[PDB]
Amino acid sequence: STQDLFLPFFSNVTWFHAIHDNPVLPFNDGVYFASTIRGWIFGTSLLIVNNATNVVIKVFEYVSKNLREFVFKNIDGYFKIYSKHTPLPQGFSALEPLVDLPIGINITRFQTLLAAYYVGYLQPRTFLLKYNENGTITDAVDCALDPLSETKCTLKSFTVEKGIYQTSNFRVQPTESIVRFPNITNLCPFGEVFNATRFASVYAWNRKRISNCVADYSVLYNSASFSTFKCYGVSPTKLNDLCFTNVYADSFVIRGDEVRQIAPGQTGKIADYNYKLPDDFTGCVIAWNSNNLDSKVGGNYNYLYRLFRKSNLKPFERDISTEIYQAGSTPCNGVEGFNCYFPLQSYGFQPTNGVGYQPYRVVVLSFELLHAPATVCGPKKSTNLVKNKCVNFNFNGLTGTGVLTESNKKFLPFQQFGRDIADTTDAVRDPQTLEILDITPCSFGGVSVITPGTNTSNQVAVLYQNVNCTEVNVFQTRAGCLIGAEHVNNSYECDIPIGAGICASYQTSQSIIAYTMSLGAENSVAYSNNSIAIPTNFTIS
Amino acid sequence: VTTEILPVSMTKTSVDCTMYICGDSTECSNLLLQYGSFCTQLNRALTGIAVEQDKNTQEVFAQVKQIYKTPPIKDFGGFNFSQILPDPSKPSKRSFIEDLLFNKVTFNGLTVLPPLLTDEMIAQYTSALLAGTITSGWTFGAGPALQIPFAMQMAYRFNGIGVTQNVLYENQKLIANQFNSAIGKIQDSLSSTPSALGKLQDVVNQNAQALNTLVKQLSSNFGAISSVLNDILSRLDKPEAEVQIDRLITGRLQSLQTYVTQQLIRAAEIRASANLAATKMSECVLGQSKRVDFCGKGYHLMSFPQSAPHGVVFLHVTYVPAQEKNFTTAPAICHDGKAHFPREGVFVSNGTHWFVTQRNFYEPQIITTDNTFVSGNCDVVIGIVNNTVYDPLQPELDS
Amino acid sequence: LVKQLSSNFGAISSVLNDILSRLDKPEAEVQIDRLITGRLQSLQTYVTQQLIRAAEIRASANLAATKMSECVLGQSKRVDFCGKGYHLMSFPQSAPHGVVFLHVTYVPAQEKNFTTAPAICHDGKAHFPREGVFVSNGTHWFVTQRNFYEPQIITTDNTFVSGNCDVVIGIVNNTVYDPLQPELDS
Ligand SMILES: *[C@@H]1O[C@H](CO)[C@@H](O[C@@H]2O[C@H](CO)[C@@H](O)[C@H](O)[C@H]2NC(C)=O)[C@H](O)[C@H]1NC(C)=O
Ligand SMILES: *[C@@H]1O[C@H](CO)[C@@H](O)[C@H](O)[C@H]1NC(C)=O
Ligand SMILES: *[C@@H]1O[C@H](CO)[C@@H](O)[C@H](O)[C@H]1NC(C)=O
Ligand SMILES: *[C@@H]1O[C@H](CO)[C@@H](O)[C@H](O)[C@H]1NC(C)=O
Ligand SMILES: *[C@@H]1O[C@H](CO)[C@@H](O)[C@H](O)[C@H]1NC(C)=O
Ligand SMILES: *[C@@H]1O[C@H](CO)[C@@H](O)[C@H](O)[C@H]1NC(C)=O
Ligand SMILES: *[C@@H]1O[C@H](CO)[C@@H](O)[C@H](O)[C@H]1NC(C)=O
Ligand SMILES: *[C@@H]1O[C@H](CO)[C@@H](O)[C@H](O)[C@H]1NC(C)=O
Ligand SMILES: *[C@@H]1O[C@H](CO)[C@@H](O)[C@H](O)[C@H]1NC(C)=O
Ligand SMILES: *[C@@H]1O[C@H](CO)[C@@H](O)[C@H](O)[C@H]1NC(C)=O
């Protein structure tokens, strides 16, 4: 059983005539072709010719009752050709490949040079192939042509015994997509924290709190001014379609090569003595050299760091302490000297230094994915609200699919989400307006196929389990919706169990009938208080 | 009259493995394709369980060829089955006790499939078995139904436990009163005690607990950054979203396999219980069993079935001896140097002289050559006693 | 189980030789561990399902053994344990992976309606049948066995006396032929 681009069974292939000029043809993902026309132009390039001696092909060059069946397709540029000499009738005739062109042409056209011919296109269609003992495809099944073929594929057989088989799962597909972001317009002040004049020094890193705005992180990873722009727990690409409660831009300036210390779980100077990120960090780190202005001649010692600290740090805590650091047991009490150190020192930043030495501006954007109302959103357009229909909704950046309805749930002003046993959002609150709407997974169920033996027949009934007939000759059970069975009012021995007392059988102009099964022939024993039935004979069973 | 409650079936569930694991995400579905055919195995197993449940119900209840009906006039020798016969007033033709029993047993790819036999169909089957037992006895289970008066049937059964049929015919009113009182006491003992149907409720609760655990297991990260596939996909790119989704797939697949294994084991237990219930319907309802404690406590007379949610309830009617009396007894009797043994019963004496009685009900009778048989002389039996044996021809022999 | 070896389980290939002939030890180790994880899960699943099926088969075999002992090596009174009907005898036949029991049963047939009585009044004495039931074809009363109509004259040999005929419900009046008095020519 393969999953390739095939010509689906019993499809509408165009029939063209050339003599009363070859007409224009498209070329989708693939093409079929037949004839009673030697050559096939392509393009949007490739050319084929039969000089009656050897096939000639050019773009590159290559040389090598006639139902000449052909198939052409293109995948990542590779152009495959298959064919067969069949002496559109019945039967199967699989097409061995003859050639592949491994170059790659973007094809969106098709032509023909030189009668009458046929053309059929290909779709990705799972097929069940029957390799015979001699190794040749003698038969096949299109798994999506009809319910019987789907049953055959599910069973992986070409013969199906009488019974009921669940072959796949039905579920309604979404009609349209929905986006509901808050009505915010002011842009987030990213240029300020990024193009500020002086970033606070690494020991007093300054944390701006961006909130209630529309951030366009597209321009951040677009600009090439950043040596490092790397995110954790998130991808920059998808930052424009997420809504965060608020952002924290912790800015400072650090040594050139101590940059990779700004990352979760990192150990070293700045991690454990000045600034560490939590191991559950969700956000981006931006670092870029500041040699242009920061460093000057003579030693720019106005940017400090904290060298000694008695112990390590928490994630996200700042130390503005300038108090001396005591290494020994002798108290210092504010005087330097023997074992009395000053824990703050100054970066030596001159443009005469090395390349891995210049000052690097570092801004760490930390995001919090809380359930509070989202204030920092992305540059994404809100749409209208659709109820009573399976839709692809997006509320405040969380995707999903289902039907939205008016809910009577009493959200309290601080709640924005209902939640299920499985941590599934059961209900939500619009950001644009303020109303509570319930989310429900739009209908799904199993699809069972009632078929008698393929020997008996080839028509089937279809059961859509635990669904109404309104979201799918037709007959509603307590087992689901039957399609293809005649509901009689009679009652017979159960043949194929549907459920809820309903059975299905093949009989009468034979058809599939659905009936309520009978438990047996009624009987009333001739009971009286002075009557007895006695046997006069026996059978040996 | 004693009850025996047996579970027969359990709830038929289906789980779309690919929808429990990968709700609607196609990234996750393509990533789960590379685990092979685990989903197919799981669905096959659950479908087998579901089929087995309907099979169990058939085996238990579908034991009558025809649907027997009780006559309009209920003249059963004083016996009153009104509490176990169907009530035509109710929409569902259920008995009073069946109604009483049915009142005491109370997405994410998960569906519940309806049973093939409705509660109405099962109640019809039970009513048919009841009517057959009432009108025809054990004949309808061994061939054609042969009508017989109920008192004569109960005499048959009394002989089946070793008690002569005169004993029933001479105490018919008392026996009927005892039976009707015991049925009433069943009604009351059931309506009052809340945990009388603990077994069925336990089956129900086990299934619900298992499903709830399965469902809650989707809130677990399994090592990933989140338990929600959409959040992972709306936040991460393909290469690392793939890692997180693989963690989630591993976890949810393990959870589902645990569920299915536990359900297979429970279904085996339930199949054993249903086979036992079927054997009891055949041996206790469609017949009179000599097996001790198999159809209630005591000497089994007759059992009556009643449907229950996911199960069956047997009302076993047994004969329990009572009001014992002490006697002195002997294995044999010496008379004219011949040893007499009882053909059917024992020799007892009230103290003065000797009688022969049946073993299960004191009914003393004169020791004759009709109640006894001779074998040997009275010098080899240990415990043999002297007493006259009345030949019922000599005083009759006036001619 | 065999098809589960064509699955990657996350690896670059399902074939160990391909992974070993293409990658060095440190990363081939990663891929092989993925394959091991998956194939081991598959094998555990197979073994568990086989244990469960073996339990089912063991139960069926114990049932078949009980039926060989009770239906074949004896005659069973258990209803429907050895076929439908009153069991006479069973015969075993081997079959692939199993056994086939041919249950020979007696099924009554050709029923006839009769009118019956629990007892009979004669000389102020209530007679009950020792083995069988009292029936009447409309004119005379007879005593027959319960499973085959074979009517016989009601004598003091076919019946036993217990009490008088004023306590049995449904007792009828009919003569009981003592087979001594017309014989009592002496
Ligand atoms: C008991 O039943 C058997 C059938 O099982 C009867 O036998 C048949 O009798 C008819 C005519 O008497 C013949 O034509 C058939 O060939 C017989 N069949 C067999 C299998 O023997 C038998 O007559 C019945 N006995 C009574 C008394 O009714
Ligand atoms: C049978 O019992 C019911 C009580 O369950 C009573 O109402 C009814 O009258 C009784 N029938 C007879 C004939 O005694
Ligand atoms: C029989 O006699 C014994 C004497 O020890 C006594 O304990 C017992 O209760 C008596 N049984 C009955 C039924 O009277
Ligand atoms: C024993 O029974 C006989 C007859 O039933 C009676 O005459 C006698 O008085 C009884 N004796 C005792 C001790 O019960
Ligand atoms: C019963 O036991 C008594 C003494 O316990 C003894 O005298 C008598 O012979 C015994 N009878 C039998 C039949 O064992
Ligand atoms: C029974 O009678 C015989 C003779 O009639 C006598 O030998 C024997 O001892 C008697 N048994 C008893 C227990 O009296
Ligand atoms: C016995 O009589 C009843 C009368 O209702 C009749 O329906 C039944 O068929 C009779 N039985 C036989 C075996 O003829
Ligand atoms: C009943 O049977 C007896 C003897 O077999 C016979 O004389 C009589 O005529 C029969 N009566 C009927 C109504 O068949
Ligand atoms: C049988 O019922 C009739 C009325 O249907 C009645 O006259 C007769 O006494 C009853 N006999 C018995 C034994 O129940
Ligand atoms: C039976 O006979 C007795 C007297 O011989 C009589 O009193 C009684 O009424 C009779 N029974 C019937 C049902 O005729």
Residue numbers in the entry:
A (entry chain C): 50 to 69, 80 to 95, 101 to 108, 116 to 130, 168 to 172, 187 to 209, 216 to 242, 263 to 620, ...
B (entry chain A): 722 to 827, 855 to 1147
C (entry chain C): 962 to 1147
Authors' own words:
The viral surface spike (S) protein is a key target for prophylactic measures as it is critical in the viral life cycle and the primary target of neutralizing antibodies. S is a large, trimeric glycoprotein that mediates both binding to host cell receptors and fusion of virus and host cell membranes, through its S1 and S2 subunits, respectively. In the prefusion state, the S-protein’s RBD domains alternate between open (‘up’) and closed (‘down’) conformations. The receptor-binding site, which can bind to human angiotensin-converting enzyme 2 (ACE2), is transiently exposed in the ‘up’ conformation.
In addition, A942P was selected for its strong enhancement of protein yields. These mutations were combined with hinge loop prolines resulting in two combos, a quadruple mutant S-closed + Fd containing D614N + A892P + A942P + V987P and a quintuple mutant S-closed + Fd + K986P. The S-closed+Fd quadruple mutant was then imaged by cryo-EM. A 2-steps 3D classification illustrates that out of 833,000 classified particles, ~80% was closed with all RBDs in the down state and 38% was categorized into a well-defined closed class while ~20% showed 1 RBD-up. Further processing of the 320,000 closed conformation particles allowed us to obtain a 2.8 Å electron potential map for the closed conformation and a 3.0 Å electron potential map for the 1 RBD-up (one up) conformation. An atomic model that was built into the 2.8 Å electron potential map confirmed that S retains the prefusion spike conformation. The closed structure is highly reminiscent of the one previously solved by Walls et al.. The two structures differ by 2.2 Å all-atom RMSD and there are no significant differences in terms of the relative position of domains or domain conformation. In our new structure, N614 forms two interprotomeric hydrogen bonds with the sidechain of T859 and backbone carbonyl of V860, effectively mimicking the stabilizing effect of the protonated aspartate residue, without the pH dependence. None of the stabilizing proline mutations modify the local structure of the protein, while A892P adds new interprotomeric interactions with the neighboring hybrid sheet, composed of both S1 and S2 strands. The stabilizing mutations and presence of K986, which interacts with Asp427 in the RBD of the neighboring monomer and Glu748 in S2, allow the S trimer to maintain predominantly the closed prefusion configuration.
